[PDB]
Amino acid sequence: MLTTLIYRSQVHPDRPPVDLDALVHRASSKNLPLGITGILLFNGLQFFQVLEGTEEALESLFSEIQSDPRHRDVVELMRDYSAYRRFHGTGMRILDLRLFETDGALEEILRFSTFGVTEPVNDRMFRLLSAFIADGGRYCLPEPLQPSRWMMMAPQHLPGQPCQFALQAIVEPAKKRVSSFEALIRSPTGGSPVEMFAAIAAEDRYRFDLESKAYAFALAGQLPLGKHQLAINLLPGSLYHHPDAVGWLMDSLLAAGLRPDQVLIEVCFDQFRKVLKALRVAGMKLALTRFQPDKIKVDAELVRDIHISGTKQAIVASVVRCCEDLGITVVAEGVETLEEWCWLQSVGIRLFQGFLFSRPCLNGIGEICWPVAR
Amino acid sequence: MLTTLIYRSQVHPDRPPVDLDALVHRASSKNLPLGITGILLFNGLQFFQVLEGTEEALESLFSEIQSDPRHRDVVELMRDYSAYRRFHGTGMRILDLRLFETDGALEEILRFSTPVNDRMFRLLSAFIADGGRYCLPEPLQPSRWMMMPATAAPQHLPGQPCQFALQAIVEPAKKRVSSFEALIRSPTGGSPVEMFAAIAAEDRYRFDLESKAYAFALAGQLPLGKHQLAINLLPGSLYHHPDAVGWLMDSLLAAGLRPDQVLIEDQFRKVLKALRVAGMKLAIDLTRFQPDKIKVDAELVRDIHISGTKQAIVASVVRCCEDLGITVVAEGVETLEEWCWLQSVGIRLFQGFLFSRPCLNGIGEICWPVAR
Numbered sequence A: 001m002l003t004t005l006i007y008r009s010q011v012h013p014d015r016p017p018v019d020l021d022a023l024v025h026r027a028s029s030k031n032l033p034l035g036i037t038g039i040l041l042f043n044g045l046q047f048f049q050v051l052e053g054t055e056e057a058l059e060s061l062f063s064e065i066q067s068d069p070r071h072r073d074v075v076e077l078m079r080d081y082s083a084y085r086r087f088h089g090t091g092m093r094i095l096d097l098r099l100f101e102t103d104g105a106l107e108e109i110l111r112f113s114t115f116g117v118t119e120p121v122n123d124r125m126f127r128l129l130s131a132f133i134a135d136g137g138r139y140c141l142p143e144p145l146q147p148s149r150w151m152m153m154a155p156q157h158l159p160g161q162p163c164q165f166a167l168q169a170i171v172e173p174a175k176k177r178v179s180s181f182e183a184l185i186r187s188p189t190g191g192s193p194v195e196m197f198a199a200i201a202a203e204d205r206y207r208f209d210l211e212s213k214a215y216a217f218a219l220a221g222q223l224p225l226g227k228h229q230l231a232i233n234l235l236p237g238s239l240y241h242h243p244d245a246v247g248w249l250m251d252s253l254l255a256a257g258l259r260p261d262q263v264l265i266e267v268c269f270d271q272f273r274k275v276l277k278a279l280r281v282a283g284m285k286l287a288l289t290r291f292q293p294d295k296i297k298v299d300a301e302l303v304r305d306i307h308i309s310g311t312k313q314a315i316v317a318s319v320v321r322c323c324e325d326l327g328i329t330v331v332a333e334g335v336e337t338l339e340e341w342c343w344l345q346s347v348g349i350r351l352f353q354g355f356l357f358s359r360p361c362l363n364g365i366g367e368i369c370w371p372v373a374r
Numbered sequence B: 001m002l003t004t005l006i007y008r009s010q011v012h013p014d015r016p017p018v019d020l021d022a023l024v025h026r027a028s029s030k031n032l033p034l035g036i037t038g039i040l041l042f043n044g045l046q047f048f049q050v051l052e053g054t055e056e057a058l059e060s061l062f063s064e065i066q067s068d069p070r071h072r073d074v075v076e077l078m079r080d081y082s083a084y085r086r087f088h089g090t091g092m093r094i095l096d097l098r099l100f101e102t103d104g105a106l107e108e109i110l111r112f113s114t115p116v117n118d119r120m121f122r123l124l125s126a127f128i129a130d131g132g133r134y135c136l137p138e139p140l141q142p143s144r145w146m147m148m149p150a151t152a153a154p155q156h157l158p159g160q161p162c163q164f165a166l167q168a169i170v171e172p173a174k175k176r177v178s179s180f181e182a183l184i185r186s187p188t189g190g191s192p193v194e195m196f197a198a199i200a201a202e203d204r205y206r207f208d209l210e211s212k213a214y215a216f217a218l219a220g221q222l223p224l225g226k227h228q229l230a231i232n233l234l235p236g237s238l239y240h241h242p243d244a245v246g247w248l249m250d251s252l253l254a255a256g257l258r259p260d261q262v263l264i265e266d267q268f269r270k271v272l273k274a275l276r277v278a279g280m281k282l283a284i285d286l287t288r289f290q291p292d293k294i295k296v297d298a299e300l301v302r303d304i305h306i307s308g309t310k311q312a313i314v315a316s317v318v319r320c321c322e323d324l325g326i327t328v329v330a331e332g333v334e335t336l337e338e339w340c341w342l343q344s345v346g347i348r349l350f351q352g353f354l355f356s357r358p359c360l361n362g363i364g365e366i367c368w369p370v371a372r
């Protein structure tokens, strides 16, 4: 089956310039008997390749390409089935973009390529080609943010309580500063939030979720929360199926020595409106045209393998800029590797949550690891 | 009930400078007895104002502010209920950001304010750091543009269980029609709702798919040429038959069209795979999967000229789709004010009554924005 694969990479600037001649001749000779067509673009620092061929042929070729020491930071942009080949003849075609002016590069690409009966701009491949020629250095990883240049650097359980809480830091590595702490519910035997709520009866869950927060607040009050925010998780029903859950939380957090604005609530268009209204007037924080939260948390699945995914990179960069304009805090969660942190920081993330920095800590403030040079 | 209203606006650069000392002193004197507080930021070209008070007091005041000829392009950024007053004992006060070094404006704020965890402060910082981002450029002012017509021949085609209206998706910069959208009509020329209501519930998926033959037939004898064509389809109409994709193929080819010319606006993945293999394009009317086109909803387009939220969402949708290589169309564009602001955030393809009204079985008349 005919498949299109599009990736982007960059060279090592510290090493001798990559031999484009030897690269292209060997590529052309190897691609032809395998039925592989396409084009390679080079701007001095970055490569950009379109590959067309069978799924079997492209999976094999890309593995060799990924593992090639001539380039690094291989970022996959597109991988889809195709109805027709855009590129014809076959040497692997190559353009050194340093030799082309404005629209001369697009003109040479369009010389031998076919993009159907409609305008080439209607083809995703052509648009991606155009974006690299126009602004390829956009998602080019900066030298200070190369992963290889970085490396990484007590309290008891309480079984007698109906529930307990583990605290995880949300950190800002650039200023080596804790931004907030999130309270995460744990069972009396140390189990996860799933295990806890499964041991509670179905008709009792909402009320348990709300009343569990008293233990999180008490934990937060006994710990040195030096003007740090505390985030707590709540089911929509826990706030809604209660006469005054906002007022309940208010009385509970104030009795523990906390302020309204110090507490953030992490979470049905109908029931949420009058609840958020009361939470806002109380002074608590919440985490687009209808309403705006104080914080948006980029999920772990967008964070996972962000260094190789041009889609995930584009989405996260789009979230950062939008939230900046709206005045909404952004936190990337589920950060497990140096690579993820580097790439998330390159697209504008400054606040992080994950096992790389700080693991959840049962009934206390855990230790934080910070990324340092070399 | 305390509320916060934040907006940005722009000066008139070719008119005598507004006496801001007079305005702010008058503002401060009027605001405080009415329980209104806040600040004004000035960067030479733009205003940024935070207003605090009751919902009723701010509505009445902001209404006077919107109709004030001393400024233009008033764009609302925030209107939300508020826990506490941030600018207590400050009716109104101006900060000229040009008289401050970096951090200086923000530090002054914090000395008469009553930080980064607050939305208002982040927005203040955003205007201080890069206020000119959504500053509407001079050649894109609504009054520097006029719509002018470029004739429509609508026809009734009897002997058909359905009809189709065609609406152009246009590219004003190249004065070019990008594609035509097929919109289903009843035999009497009634709405899509009017058409589907005549069809029995169990036959609605079969009818939706098989009605496309008449859309293909219309596009072919037009002739379509080098232009695209949505068709819209229900997901169920694609599952209804195992060779639904193969049937659409046969139908468009028999109408003299190409696969790459046709765009369609669990279970779904297998169909998506079949649509790509065949060569047809797909639109949403992201990591798993990527369409060829996304269409910005009419609600986001409505009042985008006065909504900073909608401005921000659309801009980053545009930028995201640029990086993904996805075509972006703004739908429901009714006014020049909308077109100008969509153009300023990076939209280049447009659909709406401003440009082209849907035309029963034929290519309608198109209007273009021309510079003044």
Ligand SMILES: Nc1nc2c(ncn2[C@@H]2O[C@@H]3COP(=O)(O)O[C@H]4[C@@H](O)[C@H](n5cnc6c(=O)[nH]c(N)nc65)O[C@@H]4COP(=O)(O)O[C@H]3[C@H]2O)c(=O)[nH]1
Pocket: A168, A183, A184, A185, A192, A193, A194, A209, A212, A233, A234, A235, A266, A300, A333, A334, A335, A336, A353, A354, A355, A356, A360
């Ligand atoms: N794979 C990975 N995971 C990481 C990493 N860093 C942190 N996590 C984890 O992700 C969860 C916190 O994210 P959440 O979106 O608040 O998701 C939480 C949160 O929604 C939640 N939850 C916690 N406490 C409560 C509660 O009291 N009430 C309700 N309704 N939900 C709660 O249940 C969810 C599952 O929570 P947890 O088992 O405590 O697991 C925690 C946590 O340990 C990482 O680097 N990699």
Ligand SMILES: Nc1nc2c(ncn2[C@@H]2O[C@@H]3COP(=O)(O)O[C@H]4[C@@H](O)[C@H](n5cnc6c(=O)[nH]c(N)nc65)O[C@@H]4COP(=O)(O)O[C@H]3[C@H]2O)c(=O)[nH]1
Pocket: B167, B182, B183, B184, B191, B192, B208, B211, B232, B233, B234, B285, B331, B332, B333, B334, B351, B352, B353, B354, B358
């Ligand atoms: N207010 C306003 N409206 C504008 C403007 N410009 C275009 N429109 C309209 O918006 C509709 C096209 O948008 P759609 O999301 O495809 O929405 C369409 C489309 O989803 C649809 N539809 C049309 N044909 C079919 C079909 O064959 N099958 C299915 N399943 N749905 C269809 O039903 C919807 C109703 O379509 P229509 O009556 O044809 O109404 C058209 C159209 O007249 C504007 O500037 N302002």
Ligand SMILES: Cc1cc2nc3c(=O)[nH]c(=O)nc-3n(C[C@H](O)[C@H](O)[C@H](O)COP(=O)(O)O)c2cc1C
Pocket: A009, A023, A026, A027, A028, A030, A031, A040, A047, A048, A049, A061, A064, A065, A066, A068, A070, A071, A092
């Ligand atoms: C940016 C770049 C593009 C490449 N393109 C191709 C190509 O399209 N075809 C190919 O066979 N090898 C290509 N390679 C080289 C492969 O990574 C690998 O070195 C080569 O295929 C090994 O083949 P061999 O066993 O004949 O030495 C490329 C390498 C780089 C750095």
Ligand SMILES: Cc1cc2nc3c(=O)[nH]c(=O)nc-3n(C[C@H](O)[C@H](O)[C@H](O)COP(=O)(O)O)c2cc1C
Pocket: B009, B023, B026, B027, B028, B030, B031, B040, B047, B049, B061, B064, B065, B066, B068, B070, B071, B092
């Ligand atoms: C940038 C801008 C900000 C303004 N802010 C206020 C204000 O905060 N309070 C106020 O009363 N008028 C403000 N005005 C002026 C009003 O639009 C309006 O002219 C005035 O309130 C009319 O009331 P008056 O007739 O009593 O002077 C502002 C005008 C502009 C251009």
